[PDB]
Write a protein that binds this ligand. Structure first.
Ligand code: BCL
Ligand code: BCL
Ligand code: BCL
Ligand code: BCL
Ligand code: BCL
Ligand code: BCL
Ligand code: G2O
Ligand code: G2O
Ligand SMILES: CCCCCCCCCCCCCCCCCC(=O)OC[C@H](CO[C@@H]1O[C@H](CO)[C@H](O)[C@H](O)[C@H]1O)OC(=O)CCCCCCCCCCCCCCCCC
Ligand SMILES: CCCCCCCCCCCCCCCC(=O)OC[C@H](COP(=O)(O)OC[C@@H](O)CO)OC(=O)CCCCCCCCCCCCCCC
Ligand code: SF4
Ligand SMILES: [Ca+2]
Ligand SMILES: [Ca+2]
Lengths: 645, 105, 630
């Protein structure tokens, strides 16, 4: 059953096909970057105003400031220079992306003919360049992914050297080893060029061997690289959060708070029902014009930092989940093919014994249960103490429980909030890892399905029926969906922590007494925005204030409770209801149609119902989390006084 | 929804100031028709797109979506929200210090 | 959960269970009565206040058992009366439980033929019993006549109320109780002279009679809820309800008198440490709060009773379809669904009308939202503000507006939406047109899956359709709650800080400022909830229950089963490691039918646990309309 999400599946694609797809994607990404750069032109070089501060460009902006582009200037001439540089680099991106799309089409058609020299370049054998390829490799990687890592690292070294050159000439950043200032990223680009050239030549002369991927690279290598790059993206998000909070990046990020922005959808000055433009609130600005939103109050620096960090973090988590799912698909393929017993590598042979799988998954489950129970009991006890039910004041809460002084170096203000954040992240990581391990090990047969004589014969089978009163969602696809739903909690913890919230309790800052006395008894110079449940109330003030954020709120909520319809165990009910719908639509016969209504009402397959349900669930959840991170930072450095002295 | 005008005529309501009473039911029916029509367009178009997409659509899907978002931003400047919100005296007050200056005024 | 199945119980078992339950109801009634005595005759401080007692209180004020008076001696006399009536309820409930145990356990002396108050039990019912249910309708009506007459004579004798027939006093209740006793006696004597003819409930009928009576009682409860909402709003009932606005109420779980940490300091002077802080009834609108609680309790109980009556009727229908009795029912209540073509017509018509009206009202709501938030450049003049209930229908609503139109259309759409599942239960209990086309019939009231086939066949059974009916009626019940709490259900964000959000009041010229739109209602009710620790705890517990429901809702039971096998292996290995050969504790995972049962239980439970907070936070609706934004 080849669906519309299986036509681009790698099993049907070759190496050249995916090369062409990647190049087409790179070119389209360059075109999108040109769109964004144009969208960042604050004042047009024509002599006219510009675009209204898209979130895409507001994210892109500080990086551009790091370069010679995009001055943080209110001066109109310098801002026009910023627009000119942005537009020029956008046009350059457009040209390069067009050429990349052309190359991607050539590699998609397997039609590699140079117009100037009428020769056909073989994908399996060639020289990278006229002389450079003969200088370094003397040939081509022999159609094996392990042999390509060398040339790939050499190409990455070339790209790093080119980036250094571009910074040196066009952007005018002379490499010096001062890492606090901007003009060392080019020096480190050159250092990385040297390092990666050495690594590439070593891996070309000595290819590393993990022979699992080479055979069906299309899924095994895809899964391994996707999980690795997901962890890389998580690391990049962490590094970004640490660095954007550093004073070294401050000239490029804190100044974002100094300047105000006119955002698309930010509330406009409201005219009355009778405005004779031939009554208007905020008359100095023109009618239906966006009121400026001050960065200092909005915390635009941390808002952009949070958008970047959580974008990379969630993309990395999703990439990890997809890598595990695609590795499970490959493992199921080799399990049905009989190659699972023939892999001969540590990454499979260790999991070949089902008892080792049981031990690993049981250890993960025990750690998850223990950590989750500990942290959840702490959270609910803090909530109980601050709401004072059962006659417990916050002196009985876990305010004493700070991180260890040895481990206190990596927190701004040591508190129970950081403790609960770390414990929740570990618990959610293990919680998702339960399902990831299930995908990794139980792609074909679980120990239960070993005891009970069933086996999973597909990556997208719904279930095995009502036998044993169960069998729902044992497919690796369904385990991926459960892993995503379980990691929703961890990603939510990440977002709420980076935005600023009391995760150690649920209702922190509510008009209750001991909820307000938390800061008094905790000795914190940071006033966290609010507790878990009070976070919505405190941070929806802006979301309601802004019509655009409210529209996103409504759409995400609709998406979520439409996911509800396909998530539940109701597919048969929907099928019979659709048959009734079809029968009444046929009853539009004898309503003067004289037209045979050949329209059977469709109902998604369970393997498709869970797919749609998870997609809409995640989509609504994080369309709303975008508003969480776009409401504002709203963290004031002022401890709360006790309600009663 | 041809009966919306009739029920508007039968309901006792005061129209919004300086707005035509005749066009108000027209506006509301246009909104209702637009919502239903766009929902139907989305449903039908995606139903046809699920079957029309193939490996030969690889040249179309990315570029077509690019064109969609391109004209989306172009509309963001063309018809929806034009300008940098210039102040009536003529400025682009970007520095918050200027905002405090005009909060003083 | 089937341990009191009707087929397991005889008629006498049902009588005994009902008697025991009426006795325990009397016991809990006494519990509430002693839970509401403000000041004891002892003189010691008494129970603060309970939502149970704050619900009961207007009735006690109407009856004179308790008073709203502001005198300590008056409240002490009221408490003495309350304690006396609670003791009476305790004793009579104990007697009723005694009868319930003597009837659940068949130990007396003739249940097939007996005598009831023989001295005049030979005058009525010829000195014999009611052999069957058709013969039992008569004596049941006469017994209810005796109940009404007893209420009348008790009200006259013990409560000391006049028989005055004017309908603006409790004397009206006395006079109408006597009239109802007479009317019930007439109905019972006619039914004894002529038993009814609905034979389907005269065969094996426990489940059938129970289902039809439960549906009738559920509709009666919905009618009672509407009637109570209208009457509790009437000025004639105002002396018993609007005084809740004029009084202060100290409720459990309210913000205590906040103590210091170096205290032997307190927030409020002269109110001791950890003391429930006073609340003004005008701020809460406690009259509207109490009537909301009562009316919504009745409405949801009626909805649930209707759903369960339809479900049990579907159970009986499957029973009589399995043994071939379905095809020989002479009662019209089966002949209108036996053809299996009228079933398709009815369900398709209901689906189509529900679709049309629901799509219309949803389009109206979203257009109101779009004109609110000025999305796509739509002013407030582009909304459905001209759209109101017609003057003919305007007498139904006070302050007619788009709010009332959307409420009526939404409640009708929700009724039809739940009726889709109710009709699916009612007609496709054994045979469905799809399942007749597929060649597969059904045989159990709870078959959850029937396997992944034709894409999957989850949730076809009668029980699963009951769960879906409850799920879809959650929206209708939410509409009822949000209308009785004053929410602006016509749009999504009304009164919100935004453009053209207040403007509604300047556009519709409303004399009543509604609370908030759909999404701004949560904010504007939680601003008051978060003050209370009790409502906050209910909030969190309800959400906890709600999301724990999803572990059994989703199509995930098999994943849970293999995970439970893994958990069992882990537990066995560990318990055999640190302890000697202890082998036990298989992890129990609920079956898919039971999984749906628990999931619906938790979903409904949490959802309406939170709707209780909606209805108990306060009314917070002002008569002064919002100003134009200009
Ligand atoms: C960080 C870099 C990642 C990576 C990021 C991406 C991204 C991003 C994309 C691909 C795409 C593809 N990649 Mg990859 N991929 C990685 C590693 C690999 C490896 C490997 C090492 O073995 C292989 C064999 C592939 C193979 C493939 C194909 C499935 C496909 C390109 C060929 C084709 O013509 O598509 C035919 C179809 C098209 C090229 C375009 C179809 C239309 C649109 C553009 C598809 C969008 C899908 C989705 C929304 C992408 C969203 C990303 C999320 C927002 C986080 N990837 C590395 C590790 N790859 C694209 C693909 O199609 O994904 C399904 C794609 O979106
Ligand atoms: C590549 C596909 C698209 C494209 C899409 C993007 C995207 C997407 C972005 C830019 C952005 C940039 N683009 Mg471009 N752009 C393209 C073509 C170009 C070309 C060119 C002649 O091909 C040039 C000179 C530029 C120029 C630039 C700069 C103005 C700017 C910052 C570059 C930089 O920091 O790189 C840093 C260079 C290096 C790190 C070395 C080279 C890459 C190495 C070998 C790969 C590993 C690093 C990888 C990028 C990150 C992974 C880290 C992990 C730890 C492994 N674009 C094509 C058409 N462009 C950025 C932006 O605007 O920022 C706001 C940005 O994020
Ligand atoms: C470490 C570098 C890469 C990595 C590289 C590879 C490679 C290479 C292969 C896989 C493959 C698989 N990967 Mg991997 N994978 C990583 C992260 C993950 C994570 C995760 C969330 O941590 C998961 C769940 C998976 C999931 C999976 C499975 C689908 C599959 C292995 C099945 C098996 O029997 O394993 C048995 C389990 C193990 C062998 C576990 C022990 C791991 C190593 C060998 C031993 C030392 C590490 C020690 C236990 C931990 C502490 C020290 C570490 C340095 C932190 N990958 C990271 C990102 N993965 C294989 C597959 O077929 O892909 C399609 C494959 O070829
Ligand atoms: C039988 C179960 C329990 C019991 C449990 C309860 C419960 C539970 C409640 C009371 C309540 C009350 N009980 Mg008591 N109570 C019992 C025994 C008594 C005795 C006694 C003779 O011993 C007395 C004097 C009372 C007196 C009272 C009042 C103080 C108070 C209001 C009654 C009133 O409105 O009745 C009016 C009486 C009638 C109308 C009699 C006929 C009943 C009709 C048929 C009920 C259904 C009507 C409905 C519309 C459906 C009709 C369907 C068909 C068309 C026929 N109870 C026993 C111990 N008591 C109420 C309360 O506290 O209010 C706040 C209340 O709801
Ligand atoms: C008047 C409206 C309803 C009606 C209302 C009820 C209600 C309501 C209940 C019954 C119950 C029963 N009904 Mg009935 N009953 C009606 C007409 C009928 C007819 C008929 C037409 O002849 C029949 C055959 C039956 C048949 C039956 C039995 C299945 C069962 C009695 C057995 C027993 O053990 O229950 C006794 C069982 C209980 C003790 C357990 C359930 C009740 C709760 C958990 C305990 C009561 C205490 C309470 C929680 C304390 C309050 C605490 C405060 C909230 C803080 N009903 C009509 C249709 N009937 C009861 C039963 O459980 O059904 C399964 C039950 O709860
Ligand atoms: C009005 C009186 C009662 C009623 C009385 C009965 C009786 C009596 C029985 C059922 C039975 C059933 N009830 Mg019922 N039922 C009512 C409300 C409902 C509702 C609802 C509207 O929500 C539903 C879904 C159900 C569900 C069900 C089914 C499980 C089952 C009928 C199956 C079938 O073939 O029916 C086909 C029938 C219909 C399509 C409707 C028949 C209507 C008849 C012909 C009356 C004239 C209709 C006319 C429009 C009314 C004008 C007003 C005049 C004053 C009469 N009941 C109300 C509360 N119901 C049967 C069962 O087995 O119970 C266990 C049964 O014998
Ligand atoms: C807080 C609420 C929740 C739990 C408590 C819990 C417990 C749990 N579940 Mg869950 N879950 C959801 C919520 C909760 N699921 C939601 C909302 C969804 C919708 C998508 C969902 C879905 C799936 C699927 C699809 C599968 C599972 C499993 C699986 C476990 C197996 C072992 C494990 O994870 O150990 C890790 C241990 C924990 C997960 C539990 C530690 C306690 C903690 C401190 C919270 C305590 C909450 C509460 C106070 C306890 C009740 C006491 C009182 C209130 C009466 C396992 C212990 C499955 C398996 O058996 O294998 C993994 C499986 O296949 N789920
Ligand atoms: C906005 C949210 C929802 C709908 C829209 C909807 C539409 C719908 N569903 Mg649903 N559903 C849930 C939400 C929604 N279900 C939830 C949260 C659960 C979890 C329990 C759930 C579960 C079940 C089960 C188990 C069954 C169904 C059916 C059934 C229908 C058949 C005919 C009917 O009822 O029309 C009545 C319903 C309509 C008038 C829906 C059409 C306009 C609308 C007014 C609002 C328009 C919203 C718009 C389409 C969204 C995007 C617009 C644009 C971007 C394209 C049918 C039209 C089944 C049948 O076919 O028979 C009833 C069946 O067995 N469900
Ligand atoms: C024809 C349909 C008309 C019904 C709407 C009429 C109306 O709202 O009542 C008219 C009155 C409302 O009328 C006025 O409304 C005002 C609004 O501010 C105030 O509330 C006034 O007090 C009230 O009198 O409503 C009620 O009396 C009942 C309200 C709750 C509706 C009960 C419906 C129960 C059905 C539940 C089924 C759920 C199934 C899922
Ligand atoms: C109410 C949820 C009922 C439910 O979902 O089904 C009940 C389900 C399993 O019950 P069982 O059918 O196994 O009951 C034991 C049986 O052997 C006979 O009763 O789990 C519970 O017991 C939940 C207990 C909550 C109390
Ligand atoms: S409920 Fe649905 S998914 Fe679960 S076993 Fe039954 S048919 Fe399969
Ligand atoms: Ca925030
Ligand atoms: Ca309220």
């Amino acid at each position: 059953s080849t669906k519309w999400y299986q036509i681009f599946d790698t099993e049907k694609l070759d190496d050249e096909q995916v090369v062409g797809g990647h190049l087409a994607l790179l070119g389209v990404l360059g075109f999108i970057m040109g769109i964004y750069y144009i969208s960042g032109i604050q004042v047009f070089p024509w002599g006219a105003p510009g675009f209204h501060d898209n979130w895409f460009y507001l994210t892109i902006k500080p990086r551009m400031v790091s370069l010679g582009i995009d001055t943080y200037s209110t001066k109109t001439a310098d801002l026009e220079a910023a627009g000119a540089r942005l537009l020029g680099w956008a046009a350059f991106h457009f040209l390069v992306g067009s050429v990349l799309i052309f190359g991607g089409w050539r590699h998609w058609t397997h039609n590699l003919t140079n117009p100037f020299t009428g020769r056909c370049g073989n994908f399996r054998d060639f020289r990278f360049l006229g002389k450079f390829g003969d200088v370094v490799f003397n040939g081509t990687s022999a159609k094996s992914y392990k042999e390509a890592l060398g040339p790939h690292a050499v190409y990455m070294s070339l790209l790093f050297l080119g980036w250094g050159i571009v910074m040196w000439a066009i952007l005018g950043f002379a490499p010096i080893p001062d890492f606090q200032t901007i003009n060392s990223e080019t020096f480190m680009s050159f250092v990385f060029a040297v390092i990666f050239f050495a690594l590439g030549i070593y891996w070309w002369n000595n290819p590393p061997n993990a022979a699992i991927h080479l055979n069906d690279d299309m899924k095994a290598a895809f899964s391994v690289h996707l999980t690795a790059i997901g962890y890389i993206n998580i690391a990049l998000g962490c590094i970004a959060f640490v660095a954007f909070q550093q004073p070294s990046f401050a000239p490029y990020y804190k100044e974002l708070d100094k300047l105000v922005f006119y955002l698309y959808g930010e509330p406009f000055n409201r005219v009355s029902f009778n405005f004779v433009e031939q009554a208007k609130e905020f008359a100095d600005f023109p009618a239906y014009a966006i009121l400026p939103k001050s960065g200092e109050a909005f915390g635009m620096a941390r808002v952009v930092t949070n958008l970047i960090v959580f974008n990379h973090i969630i993309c990395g988590v999703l990439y990890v989940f997809a890598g595990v799912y695609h590795g499970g698909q490959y493992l199921l393929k080799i399990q049905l093919n009989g190659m699972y017993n023939q892999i001969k590598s540590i990454w499979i042979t260790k999991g070949r014994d089902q008892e080792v799988q049981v031990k690993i998954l049981g250890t993960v489950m025990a750690l998850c249960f223990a950590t989750m129970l500990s942290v959840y009991a702490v959270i609910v006890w803090n909530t109980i103490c601050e709401l004072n039910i059962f006659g417990t004041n916050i002196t009985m809460s876990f305010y004493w429980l700070k991180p260890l002084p040895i481990f206190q170096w990596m927190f701004a203000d040591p508190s129970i909030n950081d403790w609960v954040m770390a414990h929740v992240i570990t618990a959610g990581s293990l919680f998702s890892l339960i399902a990831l391990v299930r995908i990794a090990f139980f792609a074909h047969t679980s120990p239960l399905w070993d005891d009970l004589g069933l086996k999973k014969n597909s990556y997208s089978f719904p279930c095995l029926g009502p036998v044993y009163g169960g069998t729902c969602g044992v497919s690796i696809q369904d385990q991926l969906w459960f892993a995503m739903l379980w990691g929703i909690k961890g990603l939510s913890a990440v977002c709420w922590y980076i935005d600023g919230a009391w995760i150690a309790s649920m209702m922190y800052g509510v008009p209750a007494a001991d909820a307000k006395a938390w800061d008094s008894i905790a000795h914190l110079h940071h006033h966290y925005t609010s507790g878990i449940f009070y976070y919505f109330w405190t941070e929806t003030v802006t979301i309601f204030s802004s019509s655009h954020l409210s529209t996103i709120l409504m759409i995400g909520h609709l998406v979520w409770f439409i996911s509800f319809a396909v998530w539940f165990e109701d597919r048969g009910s929907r099928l019979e209801g659709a048959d009734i719908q079809t029968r009444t639509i046929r009853w539009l016969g004898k309503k003067f149609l004289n037209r045979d209504v050949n329209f059977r009402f469709p109902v998604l397959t369970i393997s498709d119902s869970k797919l749609a349900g998870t997609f809409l669930y995640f989509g609504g959840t994080f369309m709303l989390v975008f508003l969480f991170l776009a409401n504002g930072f709203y963290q004031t450095n002022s401890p709360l006084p006790p309600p009663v002295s | 929804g041809a009966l919306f005008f009739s029920v508007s005529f039968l309901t006792g309501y005061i129209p919004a100031p300086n707005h035509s009473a005749i066009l108000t039911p027209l506006r509301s029916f246009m909104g209702w028709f637009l919502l239903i029509f766009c929902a139907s367009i989305i449903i039908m178009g995606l139903g046809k797109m699920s079957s029309a997409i193939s490996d030969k659509w690889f040249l179309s899907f990315p570029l077509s979506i690019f064109v969609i978002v391109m004209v989306m931003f172009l509309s963001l400047r063309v018809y929806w929200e034009k300008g940098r919100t210039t102040t009536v005296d003529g400025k682009y007050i970007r520095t918050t210090a200027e905002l405090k200056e005009f909060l003083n005024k």
